[PDB]
Structures are given as C-alpha cells and as structure tokens.
Design an enzyme around this catalytic site. Structure first.
Site, PDB file in Angstrom:
ATOM      1  CB  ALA A 194      -0.922  -0.003   1.200  1.00  0.00           C
ATOM      2  CE  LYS A 573     -10.357  44.551 -32.345  1.00  0.00           C
ATOM      3  NZ  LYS A 573     -10.925  45.927 -32.534  1.00  0.00           N
ATOM      4  CB  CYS A 670     -14.744  53.364 -30.324  1.00  0.00           C
ATOM      5  SG  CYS A 670     -12.997  53.503 -30.740  1.00  0.00           S
ATOM      6  CE  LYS A 708     -17.597  47.006 -24.886  1.00  0.00           C
ATOM      7  NZ  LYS A 708     -16.518  46.180 -25.473  1.00  0.00           N
ATOM      8  N   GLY A 793     -14.794  44.725 -17.801  1.00  0.00           N
ATOM      9  CA  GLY A 793     -13.915  45.680 -17.155  1.00  0.00           C
ATOM     10  C   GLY A 793     -13.162  45.116 -15.966  1.00  0.00           C
TER      11      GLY A 793
END
Ligand SMILES: O=C1NC[C@H](I)C(=O)N1
Ligand code: SF4
Lengths: 1012, 1019
Positions: A194, A573, A670, A708, A793
């Site tokens: 063992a 993107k 943006c 967004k 974020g």
C-alpha cells in the site's frame, strides 16, 4: 488658544520613531554597532555553534511551506509559461502553469483538481518532492535574480486548502452507471503493497471504472515509506490519510496483515482465486546490510535506517499505529553511516530522540554527496557534523554496548578510482550507530512468491519500461521494486503508467479493445456537477464567461479555438460596412503603468489606440455562419458600428442577423479614433442619439441586441435608460476608460507613432478600471432592475466574475485577462465559479471568504504555537526575544513528552447563477444610509505582526497618531485615539494581522476647536 | 470559399505549442521522463561532481548582483520600515529605508546620494558586505516565506548607475568659501595607509572643510585589501578607483611609495613637519606565520594568503599596477589551510590560476567554520573539497616542489576542549599549499614608528572605542589595525567615527569649539544645486511638490511636520462653515484591488468614503495663521466648500483669506457624501454652477483661488473653462474617481459600515487613476494654454511628477503616495527632480531614459559575453545548450590568457553640462507637442517586434499573447524555447507589453510593405 498646529508633548512622544530625513551623516562607533546588532537578529548566527534543542519536536521544518499571503505572491510571480519546462521536468507531468494560474486567481479548488488529476498523491509530493532535481530545476525564472518558483510549496498550499474543504472524489460523471459497465470492469484486480505506486495504480484503475480492486498490505499501517520512514516534521501522517481516503472514495479496498510470500500470498494463489491482473508495489522491504554489523542489536545501540526511522515514525505519527510506542531513547554521540538522502533523515530524526550530537560519516568526499541539497541543508542548519573520506571497519563494543567505530581513510587517485588505506585506522567515539546504506529485496520467501516472473541482473523483477508489464502478461510492477524510481512522484507515475496497460490487458482478455491514444481520466468531485449555465434576454449560455469584442477576437479562427477551450460565448471584433473600413497604426497596445515597474504576468491594465476590425463585414458574416454551424450551443454576438445614419445601422444589423448571429452588440463607445469619423463616443455620450440608434436597430432586426456603453460620461444611467427606451434588450457595461498611460522622461509618449513620436488619448482596460466598471454595473442594475447587463472591465477570475454577477450582471465579458495569458483561463473560471457556488451550501465552511479559509495566526505561513507561556508576552520573532520563544517551545515539547475524516455534505441547495445575480445591491445605498454610530477601531494580532511599522507610519503622516510603536520590540499597539479610518489595515503586509472591531468606548469626533 | 473561421495547416503548425487544456491525465513513463529532464535543466545537477573550467575566468560570481528590472522588483518589495532594524544592523547606519524607496521610485541618484552620505565606499560595500551577518540579518522580511531583501545588491545597483552618470562630488554648498574658512581648517592632516578606513576618514574631514589632507600609502596601488586581496570576480578594481576619485574631488591628496616606518615616516617626523593630526589606517600588513612553514618558498609551491592573493589581484585587475603581471601557475592539487573567509577567496582564486583540485583543510569541524555562509557557498558550488578535524604538522618537499602535507586528527572532549592526537598522522597529497591563518602587525620598524602611543595586550594600538583616539591626543587609529573591525564597512565607520573627533581635536587646538551634537556633512554633487522652484498665479513655490487636501492633511500639526520635512506647499483638509459640520463613518479608507492580492508597500490605489474635515473653520483659520507665521516661504492653500449659496461662499472664502492663506481651493468635486448635502459632485459637474461659484469667490477675495475639478464628467474642459470664465486663477485636476472597490464572495462590500454591512460609491485615488488624471491635465492644458493647473492623481515620484509637468501642470499635489509611506518621500521627489533636470544637459547620456541607462543585453542582470562564437548560435541558457555556452566561454578565457595584452588604462572623467539646466518653467507643457487626434498619427510608419534572444528567458508569453490575443505571428521553438517574430507581425505591441524582461523585445520600423488583413477582399 494653544498652538493648534503643533503636537503636544504626548504626541511628539508617540512620534519618536516616525521617519524623518537626517540633515547630517550619522555617528555610531563600531563598538556600539557590534553591541546593538544582536538585538535585531532574525536569521541564524554564523558564530553560534549550537542551535535550540529539538527533542520530541516534530514541527514542520520545510522552508517551502506557504500560507495564503505567501502563496498568492509566489503564484502571481509565476510566468505561467507555454510548453513549460517545469511540467516537462515533473515525473507525473503536472500542468504546473494551470494550477499556479488558478492559485493566483484564488481558485484553490481548480488548482487542486488539476494537481490530483495527474498525481493522486498531490499533497504528499508537494511537501516531499526533491524539486531542485525535478520541476523547479527546469523553471525559467531561474534566469532571474529573484529565482525559481517554489512549485512544491504552491502545490502543497492548494492541496491543503482542498483537504480542508473536505470534498470527496467521485467517478467521472460521464462514465456509464455501475450496472451498465461491461463485465470486464468487474475483473478482480490485486495490488501488493500500500505505497505510492499501488495507491496511484489502484486510483487510476478505479477512475477507469474497475469495481473490484484490492490492495494487500503486509504491515498494519498504509502509505508505505511516506508513513514508515519520511519524518513527521517533513510529511504529516495526516496528509497520507487524506490521500488514502480520497482513493477509497472510488471503492478501492485495502486489506492489511496480508503479505506476498511463499505460503502466504503468491501469484499462483491469486491466479487460482480468480484474479485477472496483479500489480507489484512492495518496494525494497529490507535494509542493505554489511558484515561488520553482524550480531549488533538495538540494545547495544545499532540500527539500520529500516529499523530506526520506523520506530521514530510510529512514535511521532498519531494514527499510524494503534499502539503508542515510546520515542527511541538516543543519548550521547550518534553516528550515521552514509551520505544518501536517508542518512540525513536519520540524522535529523536522531536529534528529536535526544541525541547530544550527530555525525554523518561517509566514505567519499563532500562533493560526492548526491542527496538533494535542500535535504542536506536541513541537517546542516540543525548542526549535524560531517566527516568525509571514512569507511567503516569495526564496531568496538565494550560492556554490552557500542563505544566507538573504527574507520579507514579513503582517497581518489588519478584514474578516478577510490582506495581505502588499511593502515590509516580511525577511532570515532559513539553511543549509537545507524547505517543508511540503502534498501533491497532479498527475502527468498518473497522472491519465490513472484514465480515465475523474470528477474534482471539487479535481482529485481524485470518489466517493460513503457508498459510496466512483467514476463507474465497479467502481472505488472512499479515503484521502488523496479529499481528506476528514486522518488515518491516517480513511484506514483509508475503506478499511473501501469494502470493504462493493465486496463488494456484486462479489456483484451474479455475480447475488447481500447483507444489507441491513452485516456486516463482526470480527477473529479461533486463540485464538477455544479450547474453554471444562465439565461439572459432569451439566450441560453452554457457558462457566463465570454470573450469581449477585442484583440482576443481579432479573427474568427481564434473564436473557434476559444469555443473549443470551453468559453460560453464570444463577441466578434467590431465590424462595419465597407465604406467605413479602417486601418490601424502601430504601436497601438501598451502595458499599464498603473501598478509600477512590474513586468510580465498580471499587468494591472493596458491602454490601446486600436480601431475597430480591419476585416470586412463579409468575412465576419461568413465566419459567424461557420461558427454557429459548428458550435450551436455557444453564443456568438456580432459587434457592429455605423455613423449616425439610419440606413447604415439597419443594413449592417440585418446583414449580421442574417448570418446567424444570436444577438448584436452596438458599439457606441469607442473612446478614440472612430470619433473623428463620426462614431464611437460622440454617439454614445448623448442619450438622444443612443435612443434613436437603438430604435433604428430594433426596427431592423428580430434577434436581441445590446448597446455597449462608455464609462466616459457624467451619468451612465442616462444612456443606459436611453438604450432601454430605444428598444435594446440590454446593455454591455462598459467599454474602455479614456486616458493617457504616460510619458518617458524626455516628454515623448507611449505608445508613440512614427518618427514624430505622436499619440492620442487611448482606452484603458484591465483590473485598474474594475472599480469604474463595478460602479457602472451596480448603478445601472439599481436604476433599471431586471434589465440585462453584460459586464466588462477587469474580470480576471471566477471570484471577480462573481462580484459582477452579485452586482447585477448576467454574463461576463473578458479581454485583458486573456491578453495577460491565453484562452485556457476559461477552465480556471469555470471550476472556480462552480466551487464558489458549491461552498455556499457547506455550513461548516461559513467562516471562509469564498475559497479562502479564515486566516489563522501564523509566521511564514506556519501556525503559531498556542502555548500559554507565550501568549501575551510581547515576544517578537527576533533577537533575544526569539531565543526566549524557542526556549519556551522546547520546554513545551518536553512537557508533552511527559503526558476521522468525514466529507461535508451540502445542507442546502447549491445556488444557480440566477440565484446570485444582484444579491449585493441590498448593501448599496446613499452615504446617509450608513451608520455613523457603529464605529470601529483597529486591533492588531501581535503574533502575526512582522514589525515593519507601516501601520504606525500611515497613522502618523496620514492618520491620527494613534499607534504606539515599541522601540525595543517593534510591536505596534493601537490606542484609543483611533478613529477607525482603516488605513493601517489597508497598508499592512500581513493579511488579517489587523482587523477592525466594534468600538466599545463612546466615539467623539475631533473638532480641533469647540463649536459655538 | 475557404473555411474562414479555421486555421490553415501553417497556422495550426505555428500553434503547436500553444496551451490547450487537457481532457485526460497525461501518460509518460518514468524512463521517458528521466531522459527528458536533462534537456531543460537550469540549475546545478546534484549528481554532477565537477564545475565548469574557471581558469582565468574573473567574471562576476556574486549571486546578489542586480540589473534594473530585478532591482525595481526587489525595491518595490521592501517594506521601507520605520526605525528599520536593517539600518540598526548596518555599521555605517545607512538609511536603507530611504535609498531603497528612491530606487523603487526610479530615483537612482537620490538612492546613491543617501548611500554615500553615510558610506564613502558605498559601491564596494554593496558588493562585499557580508549582509547575512549585518543589515540583511535584521531584515523584517525574513519573517516571510519570500525572505529578506537583497540590500547589498540594491545598494550596488544604485551606486553603479550613479557611477555611470559620471557626476563628481563637491563640498557642501552651504560651507563658507575656501578663503573665508577659519585658519584651523588649513591644519596639515596626515593619514597612513590608503585603505577603507583612511579613505573614509579623509573623505569626511574633507567634507568638513579641511583643505590640507594627505594619505601616505606604502604600496604603489591604493584601496588596501579591497584592491590587493578581494578577488576581481567579487569586487572589480574599477569600483575602487571610482570611490577614490570621488574622494579626490574634495582635494584629498594621496602619495604612494611612502611608508610608516622607523626609516621613513614616524609620528615624530610628522610632528616635526608641522602636521596637527594623524590617522593610522595601515591595517594588519603581515601574514600570520607558523613554524612548520619555515624556509618554504613559492618556488616549492608554498604561499600565505598575503603572498598569493596579491599576485592574482595584480594579474587580474587592470589598473592596479601598470606593469604586466603573470597569473600564478598553480597546477595539481591545492591545499588551503584554514576555514576563515580568506581561505575561501584563496580556494576560488586558486581555480582561476589553473588548479586541478582545491581542498580546504581546517583543524575544527564543519560547524566551526565562522566564514560568512554566502562566501562558503561560492567555494562549495565551484566544487572545492572540505576536510575537517585536521591540523597541519609537516610539509613534504621533493625535487624542490611540495608533494604532500602531514596532519594529525583533532576533536572535542566532553569539556568542549580541542585535542590533537599526535599518533593519528594523516598524509595528504598536494602540489601547492596556501596558509590563510590571518594577518598581524609585527614588523618592529613599523611599531617603532608609532612611538610613543600605547599598545594593548593584543599588541595593537589602543584607542578609545568612541573617539578612536590613541594615548597621544593628536593621533587616531581605526580599521583592521585597531582589531575590532572585521569588515570593509566597519573599517569605513572607524574612519567616519574618528573624523569627527579629529575635527574636534584640531578645532580645540586653534581655540575653537564644535557643536555638542555631531554634525558630519552629507554627500553632495552639482545635481543638488539644481533649482526646482516654480512660480504660478503669482505665487512662489520653493519646489513643485505639495500635499493634496486629504488624509495626510487631517491636522495642521501634520502640515507643520511636512513643511519641516521640506514639502513646497500644502492644502488644508477641506473645511466649511459651522452649519455644514460633518461626521465621518468607519471603516472609510480601503486598499485598492486594482493590482491583485498584493499587500503592503505600493498599493496601486485606495478607495475612500470620507467626507470633508471634521475640524472647524476656526481651527483651520487659526492653524493657517500659525503655519504662515512659522513657514512664510511654504505655500498654504485653504480648501473650502459651501452649498450653492452666494453668501456662504463669500463668507467662508473671506474668513480663509483673512487667516493669511496664500490662496484658496474650491472643493467642487467630492464624489460622495457631500453630494447629498447639496455639495461637491453636485455643483462641480455643471459648467453654469461652477462659473457662478467662482464669480462669487472672485468678488469676495483678492488672493488667487483654484477650482478643484472632478474627473467624473463627460467633458472636464467645459468645467475648467467655466472656472476660468468665473475668474478662477487656475484649476486643480483632479479629485478622486467614482467607483466601487469590490465585494467579498458572500456579496458584502468593502468598506462595509455597521452590522448591515452597507456601503456607498467612494473615491478612487492612487496610481490606478493616473491615466485619467494625465488625460485631464493634458486636455485642459491644450484647450486653455497658459491657464495654471495643479495636478493630482497618482503622483508618487519625481519621474511621475515630471510627466504631469510635461503635460501642462505647474505644481504637483500628492496623497496616496504618502498614505503608502510617509512625509520623507519629499526628499526623494526633490533629489529625483533635480537629477532628471540635470541629466537633460549631459550630452553623453542622451541614450538614457531619465535616470535609467539604456538596457544592455543581460541574463540575471549580468552583461552577456560578446564572444563571436556565441552570437546568433541559438544557445538558450539551459540544458545541453548551457553546457555549450560554458565550454565556449571557458575557451575564450584561455584565448584571452594567451594574449597577455597588458590591460588598457582607466581614465575616469566627469561629464560636464554642455547646455543650460532647464528650470521647471522650461519643461512645463513640453509633451503637448506630441499629442493630437488619431488622424494626425501616421499609418504608413508601421513597426514590427524584434526579440533579443540573448535576453530572453524562454517563457513563451509573447507567443501566447500573439496566439490568443494577436496574429499568430510568433514561432516558438520546441527545443530551445526561443521565439522568433515572423513577417505576419502587425506591430500591435502586445508581446512587448507582456514580456517579463525589460527591453528584450523592441519595436522597429517595418522594412516590408505593410498590408492590412481584410479576411475577405473588398468590392
Ligand atoms: O475623495 C474625496 N473624499 C472626500 C471629498 C473629496 O473632495 N474627495
Ligand atoms: S507586435 Fe503583436 S502581431 Fe507582432 S509578434 Fe508581438 S503580439 Fe504578435
């Protein structure tokens, strides 16, 4: 009125040790300095020839042990390398990069899961692996001044926390049910011994689904050498018991008192009893002896490592044996023969038994010691003496006991041959002698029980190094018995390696084949069953983590790989119509300077001046169709942007919708570049414009879409509300923060574009903007309850992700965390979130903060002794005070010499993501809703303090001069002039050393001058 | 069409080593693992019995040497403790807290200045101090798993950068001119021996103003043991030359070839020649000898440490001796007798001479070795053998060469006494024998020259341990000669200690007294003369640094201490009229979570829910009167706040003006608490309200006043413009950023107030908000040119301060940096700004970024060898590749040895400002020229990443970032783990941004035509 702008005598006194720049050079004679040095001494004195007493002291002496504070720092430091050399240097191939990443993210469960997946004895190995010769030996950070990563310590920490969670192991939830398993899996399997090798082998076989596994152990105790010889002060027995029980959770059976030997258990008896396969892991049970010790007994003071260490173990390891045996009475001079690693454990163990002095005598030179440096170091700091070039010859006995040992000098000649000059005899005094010449397999009764397997020249069973199979197809061997492994981890690997081919062998015996590619299962627990799916705006996410529209989604091929890794969703993107095609500049993405000149892993932020996608809408729309066709359950959200033009927004949104996108994200945030083209913020800072754009899109498509939002506005709620009024199904909060990351000393910026070294305001992302994003998410959630929010974020872990969920978000977008690492972090986020939700149902772990246990008083991560003679004595850990602490500790050990693991069960339903969303909002409110009568004050735990005086300096030049800093002990004391501002706790280097507690005295604000 | 969302074969191939989570446990046999391990090996192999060849290899072997990257990390880690134990454990009492703080702030000049202020041999000591037995031995960080701070390495780094700056030392600019110095300072002073002790003593005497100091050195070389015996591979000779020249900048004279001996210089000849004081620092010039070595010569192979080490030194240290010195030819077995620290330098040096094997034989046990562990380790890792319990008895010589040494066994009895069994003789083979039994002063001609000073029973000159004065009043002694010092630093302190009492003695001889409290001057350079004053809105600031209205200005008594420390100005905590009195809650100020679970020094931010001052306007106004009365040159600005009420604003502003404040700051930006009471954030977000408040104040007072703006607005320029139109003399940009610092796993916030664990949005401060503050300052400066701006937000060093100045601000407010430390940071900020301005006039250091030298190719901070046979060979620093590098390096050393090309000279010359040093007014706004719109940036001047393989540490992070966050443009070799940027690079710059090695990756102009990847062609 008294001089208000001046400190009264008492304060001036409390500020006595507050730093003040000198106006002149200091003046302190060399003599005064020599006399003062000893008062502050922290480390060992090179002039001290002794050391504290260690009799009956089995406290952890490992230098690699870590507490949470220390583990987090070291885990953050790890580069988390690709194709890591540390993993290549690990016998069990542990994904070190992944488990350390999980630790840095506070996901101890995920870390432990990864460790145990490849090593069933993860905790043991973390504590005992000779890393400098394994994983750590190949660590890239060795090429830095700060050095290699303490991999072992980190492995130990994560595993310790997991152990404390008391979570059991379970079979892979994907395996068919018990009764549906093919007959082959019920084949009787036998394992001998063992130890690490059999425990490992049986564990993997059990993971594969075998339901009849039995380990036959000769002794009454289990764990092999990890139990019988490795010192308690290096490996607590409690660790071994933990790993054994984890194995038993899979049904593996252990029967002690059963030995492999002629007229006991044999390959023939096992075969006749029906066993289909057998694994040999009995190790090397016998000590390598030598003529000169013939007849010598323990009564006289002679021992072999095989005799001595087990005695010390049985006495110092509670739980090992039913009988509590006495600690071997070793007094006087002790001689340990040999320079192997076992010799050093004998030397250090001897000291615990009462040895006055211990000498390590070896036949070769110091340079020839092949024991791991870390082990040699422990003996050296405990003041063991070393005697080279001496070969034993006689054990002089007078009076029924050893009185000395006779040696003969050794030496190397030119050819590099060793000679022993028989003329140069050496007389060494000694009351006890311990030989540590190694171990072997000699017992004929045992070798005979292995008939008819073939043995090699080493007199050990011969096996195929790849399959671990012996000359007999159904019999496999591994571990020490094979003679290749030299460590616990290599033995565990031998058993792991064997398990796969034993599986292959057994299945074939039943006419079944196995995958050509090895498929040993990973490690699983009930935590893995936790559901972390969530629904939002009619969309179903398999998990709440997704890739934000950003660099990680530059190409659709990257999104495919992210989905293959396990990400719940992804944003393309941002793309636009052909007429709005953009072209990026370079450089455009730089590291943040938000946390100083710290380079490499874990950048606290990034700043970018990148525009939207340079790839066309045609590329993106075709890509979305491809992605949705191949990954129907993964959510794909198309991010799009247009100028303030109704036809354009309707055209692009419809083109995106037709490609098969599950939803759209309107990029109205943006912070740079696109603004000059009449897009981005210009449109996202005006509620009216936001409302109209959303109306145009709502009217153009049927699928849901989200706006967004930018955080660069006075009131983000106004634009969020405008989006809702316009028909948006939710909002993504938030995009990057407008900023300038910095300038070089010559005034030029970074990033700097072209020969003119120009730049423009960019977007800040990462953990540095999380406070801004959290505020945005919470304010929107409170103002527009129920309105879907996709957070973004600074999300870089399950823990931080949970914070946004609690704040009102339903799903979590990630960018910077991936830029700092790679797509595999999804594995960490998912196991981490599952663990956090699971732990919320465990009643006995409510004192924990997430996966973090309540901090216990410690020093260097090692729990502080709870001795009465130590508490409240103002004995810091340095100088004469340290000497006193050691004296008291040794005394306590002498005094003490004179005198069931159960899994926690969820006592409540595991919450689902939908059950935790917004649960933090109840604590948020106005400043007026905060109580100014429930004040607190700071209280310091002197046992955890490292005497730096930072609490003192912060309160002095940034607070209320409320802390006394003792000039002799360097221990701080919070006085009652404390106002509870909490700055001291905020700058303390030791987690939880300082805590804020309810004020018991009446609080009264200092007005400086009374009011009229 | 092709499957766009899939990687083509080539990309799939480049991604071969990209991390991917496994679905199953791995399978690798133990044999396979054993065979693979050696390929990635970084550290020493415990199974290898021989260390690479070191013949003629004098490269730095110190484990403590640091490069900039490493120094910044270690400096940031330092707790910068109060009443630091490390400083108490330092013989020269260096303010370690201060110099390390300066290093973490990139102010290497300030760090070096602090170091040299208390230790004239700062660089030498940084390199050779046995720190484990000194400063580092008392470091509080020893109580952490990561361990003690590498104080020596940090001291070495700062000092090295300062050395590279080529700035000379000057006398204290406060001292009277030379012709106005009292006659006493022209007293002829003599020092014997040009070692650490005399160099230190002469340096401090020169600092005090003594103009006729001469050191007489016996040898032709200077520096003492630092030059003649400490190995070049531990202490480069040019370090010694650097410190000697700094001393000479103060006029100290050194005359070599002059010895203190009965035949030349004696105390009597010096006294007859007119010398008024003498310091004896000749050390222990002679080796401790033993009878058994009588008659043995070098030709036979025998040496004492005093004979051997100086030979190796003269041969390996360029500049020590002008003549050519042959490296001692030591071949065969070498025996070093003794286990002191000198024995170990003999052992390691023997290897450089060609020794085949080196054995260290000592008469006691291993436990009895008293040499510093760090030194012992160097010998151990270079494979020196150790033989304990052996005492020498005879040296066998045959053929005019040593062949063996006879020893006898030793051992301790129950009484702890050592015995040597004469019967048990030991024969040990050896070709060379080096005794390192210590040093002494025995030459009667030398001892005689010291007549009539008293000697003690140690046979050494006796001195008062506090004054270092001998039995003869005008004669002092220190260093090794006194027998107490065991280190360079203690010897330096002896000279330092003596300098003060020599000064006291001399002055007294001229009938003058000296201050009761010792006043040894600090270290000064021309940088300290740099003017950092600045004028703004008609106010004159002695320096641009000031305390922001915050926790550090909670009480006026704190402002007083800040001014005493040197801060240029300070804001009072914001106060109001009695009717608007506030009461704070607790907890209210927490550490930021903006940079992860990193605790202690340098928190990247703080969040607070504190209100304005709890102290009354009466307290504040009386305090301002007191402060202005005691510190007329320190600017005091009163921060005030009222609700939107004309009478209130006029009442408060006038009350503040009357107290004597130089100016006022209108708090129209508290992001929390006050908004509910109708103030702060309420009034500061609306251009109209801002304009009116400023108008009310403009007509109420005549002193200048500034509006403190909030960053929590869509367009901060609109508010700033409103303030200007309202009559404000300038604006403070900016107040804290509105945010929520985080929640615990149970959903509760931090800070949490009361049993209900409630919170409210707070204000974020610190370096985490600097990007926001810098943007605010630059945008206001561009929109309103010439309008005064007081910057605030993440300023924590001279460097960061300069960034705000370059951005348009005239003065700099600080809060978080002090909360993270204390008021003394002002010393760092001032010396740092002076240095940055000074360096702008040095033409030869234009390749530097501020005080940071251009990064040179290195590994662990040590310059990479420029051997032709190594460049462009793809030999990473691990496994078999490392073995090859060492082999090549060793060969190069042997090649250089065959040349015997007498080492090039060494002429250290100070750099001279070749242009005027800019004043603060000359740098303000100079960065604005580089700022513009995105359209003004060129998209044709593209760049690509280029990696310096010699600096790479093979982690693959550039590879991973480009793979999952870039353009899969990097190839990562599966055997060498070396990355190579391919032509598909787009110059995004992420790889450079995540690389752990500073400047390993650089962005260079693209040479190939750049073409954006559209995914699919355009129509
Ligand atoms: O951060 C801050 N807290 C208190 C009020 C202010 O102006 N700023
Ligand atoms: S600059 Fe960007 S595209 Fe180029 S090799 Fe670095 S991460 Fe990749």
């Amino acid at each position: 009125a008294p001089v208000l702008s001046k400190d009264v005598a008492d304060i001036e006194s409390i500020l006595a040790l507050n730093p003040r720049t000198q106006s002149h050079a200091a003046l302190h004679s060399t003599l005064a300095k020599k006399l003062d040095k000893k008062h502050w001494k922290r480390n060992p004195d090179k002039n001290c020839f002794h050391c504290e007493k260690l009799e009956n002291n089995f406290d952890d002496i490992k230098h690699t042990t870590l507490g949470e504070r220390g583990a987090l720092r070291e885990a953050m430091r790890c580069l988390k390398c690709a194709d890591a050399p540390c993993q290549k240097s690990c016998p069990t191939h542990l994904d070190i990069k992944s488990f350390i990443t999980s630790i840095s993210n506070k996901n101890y469960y995920g870390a432990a899961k990864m460790i145990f997946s490849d090593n069933p004895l993860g905790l043991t190995c973390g504590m005992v692996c000779p890393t400098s010769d394994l994983c750590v030996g190949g660590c890239n950070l060795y090429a830095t001044e700060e050095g290699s990563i303490n991999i072992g310590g980190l492995q130990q920490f994560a595993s310790e926390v997991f152990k404390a969670m008391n979570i059991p192991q379970i079979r892979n939830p994907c395996l068919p049910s018990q009764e549906k398993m093919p007959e082959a899996y019920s084949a009787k399997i036998a394992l001998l011994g063992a130890g690490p090798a059999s425990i490992s082998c049986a564990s993997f076989l059990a993971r594969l689904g075998y339901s009849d596994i039995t380990i036959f152990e000769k002794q009454e105790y289990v764990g092999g050498l990890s139990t019988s010889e490795i010192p308690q002060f290096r490996l607590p027995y409690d660790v071994v018991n933990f790993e054994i029980e984890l194995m038993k959770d899979l049904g593996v059976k252990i029967i002690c008192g059963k030995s492999l030997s002629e007229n006991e258990i044999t390959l023939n008896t096992l075969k006749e009893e029906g066993y289909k396969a057998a694994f040999i892991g009995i190790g090397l049970p016998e000590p390598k002896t030598d003529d000169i010790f013939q007849g010598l007994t323990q009564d006289q003071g002679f021992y072999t490592s095989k005799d001595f260490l087990p005695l010390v173990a049985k006495s110092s390891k509670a739980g090992m044996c039913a009988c509590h045996s006495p600690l071997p009475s070793i007094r006087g001079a002790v001689i340990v023969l040999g320079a192997g690693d076992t010799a050093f454990d004998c030397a250090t163990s001897a000291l615990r038994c009462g040895a006055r002095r211990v000498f390590l005598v070896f036949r070769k030179g110091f340079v020839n010691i092949r024991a791991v440096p870390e082990e040699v170091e422990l003996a050296k700091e405990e003041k063991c003496e070393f005697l080279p070039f001496l070969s034993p010859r006689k054990v002089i006995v007078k009076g029924g006991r050893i009185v000395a040992v006779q040696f003969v000098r050794t030496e190397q000649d030119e050819t590099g041959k060793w000679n022993e000059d028989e003329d140069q005899i050496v007389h060494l005094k000694a009351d006890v002698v311990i030989s540590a010449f190694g171990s072997v397999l000699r017992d004929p009764k045992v070798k005979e029980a292995l008939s008819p397997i073939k043995f090699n020249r080493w007199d050990l069973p011969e096996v195929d190094p790849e399959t671990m199979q012996t000359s007999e197809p159904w019999v496999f061997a591994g571990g020490d018995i094979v003679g290749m492994a030299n460590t616990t981890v290599e033995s565990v690997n031998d058993g792991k390696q064997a398990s796969w081919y034993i599986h292959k062998y057994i299945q074939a015996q039943y006419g079944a084949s196995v995958s050509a590619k090895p498929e040993l299962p990973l490690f699983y627990t009930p935590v893995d069953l936790v559901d972390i799916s969530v629904e939002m705006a009619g969309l179903k996410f398999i998990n709440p983590f997704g890739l934000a529209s950003a660099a990680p989604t530059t190409s659709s091929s990257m999104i495919r790989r992210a989905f293959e890794a396990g990400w719940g969703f992804a944003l393309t993107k941002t793309f636009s119509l052909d007429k709005d095609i953009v072209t990026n500049v370079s450089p455009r993405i730089v590291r943040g300077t938000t946390s100083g000149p710290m380079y490499g892993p874990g950048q606290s932020s990034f700043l970018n001046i990148e525009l939207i996608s340079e790839k066309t809408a045609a590329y993106w729309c075709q890509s979305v169709t491809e992605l949705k066709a191949d990954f129907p359950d993964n959510i794909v959200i198309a991010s799009i942007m247009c100028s303030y033009n109704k036809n354009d927004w309707m055209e692009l949104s419809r083109k995106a919708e037709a490609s098969g996108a599950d939803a759209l994200e309107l990029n109205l945030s943006c912070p740079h570049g696109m603004g000059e083209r009449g897009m981005g913020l210009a449109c996202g800072q005006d509620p009216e414009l936001v409302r109209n754009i959303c109306r145009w899109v709502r009217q153009a498509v049927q699928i849901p879409f989200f706006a967004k939002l930018t955080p660069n506005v006075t009131d983000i709620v106004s634009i969020a509300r405008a989006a809702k009024e316009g028909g948006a199904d939710g909002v993504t909060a938030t995009n990057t923060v407008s900023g300038l990351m910095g300038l070089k000393a010559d005034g030029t910026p970074w990033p700097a574009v072209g020969a003119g070294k120009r730049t423009t305001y960019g977007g800040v992302s990462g953990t540095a903007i999380r406070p801004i994003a959290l505020r945005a998410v919470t304010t929107i959630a409170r103002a527009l309850p129920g309105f879907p929010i996709l957070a973004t974020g600074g999300i870089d872990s399950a823990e931080s992700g949970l914070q946004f969920l609690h704040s009102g978000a339903s799903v979590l977008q990630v960018c910077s965390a991936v830029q700092n690492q790679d797509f595999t972090v999804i594995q960490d986020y998912c196991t981490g979130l599952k663990a956090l939700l699971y732990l919320k149902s465990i009643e006995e772990l409510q004192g924990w903060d997430g996966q973090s246990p309540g901090t216990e008083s410690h020093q260097k991560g090692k729990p502080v002794p709870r001795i009465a003679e130590l508490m409240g004595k103002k004995l810091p850990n340095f100088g004469p005070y340290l000497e006193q602490r050691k004296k008291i500790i040794a005394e306590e050990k002498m005094r003490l010499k004179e005198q069931e693991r159960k899994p926690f069960i969820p006592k409540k339903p595991i919450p689902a993501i939908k059950d935790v969303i917004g649960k933090a909002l109840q604590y948020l409110g106005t400043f007026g809703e905060l109580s100014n009568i429930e004040q607190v004050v700071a209280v310091i735990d002197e046992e955890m303090c490292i005497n730096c005086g930072k609490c003192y300096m912060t309160c002095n030049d940034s607070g209320y001069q409320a802390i006394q800093f003792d000039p002799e002990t360097h221990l701080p004391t919070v006085t009652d002039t404390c106002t509870g501002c909490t700055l001291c706790l905020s700058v303390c280097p030791i987690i939880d050393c300082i805590r804020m507690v309810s004020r018991t005295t009446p609080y009264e604000p200092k007005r400086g001058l009374p009011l009229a």
